Amino acid sequence: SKALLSFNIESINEIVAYGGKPIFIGGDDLLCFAPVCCNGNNVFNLVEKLSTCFDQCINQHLQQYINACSEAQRPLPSLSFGISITYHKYPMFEALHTTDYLLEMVAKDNLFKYTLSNKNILNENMKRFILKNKLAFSLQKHSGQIYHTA
RNA sequence: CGCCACUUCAUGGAAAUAAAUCACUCACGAAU
Ligand SMILES: [Mn+2]
């Protein structure tokens, strides 16, 4: 709880420093509106800074857990990011749908899990192959050309 | 001293070799 609190506060600070407007930062969840570029920093610099804030807060508060568990064998807590860049004259609802798709289906690999679970194939060995710690990024121009990558 | 001519008329080697084989810019823009 302490680590997530510190991360939330520093995330609001860093987002407003970059030039972005926070919408909801609490618990383990984040949503923000940021420019493509602002004063020599691009959006991916902001994403990297938020990721580093997450690792820094996890280090500061969960030092016992990292020092005792993750070194033997355990994945550290992680943060997954979904970024969508669109024209200003674009439907907000569809932009948020795209961001949700990128975060859940792609960045969290919930497409794998959902296709497997809808048909009831989700064995434990197949659950071992679920992937996290991903950056899902998409850009829609004024035309319709999409640049997406993970 | 006099007298006097015939013969031979291109073979062998080298017959192309190397460097560059597309480069840069624009890869959609504006209105809707
Ligand atoms: Mn959550």
Automatic annotation (TrEMBL):
Entry's Gene Ontology BP terms: defense response to virus
Residues of the full protein shown: 301 to 450 of 600
Keywords for this protein: Antiviral defense, Nucleotide-binding
GO MF entry, a single one: nucleotide binding
Domain named Cas10/Cmr2 second palm: residues: 1-110
Top-level taxon of the source organism: Bacteria
Name of the protein this chain belongs to: Type III-B CRISPR-associated protein Cas10/Cmr2
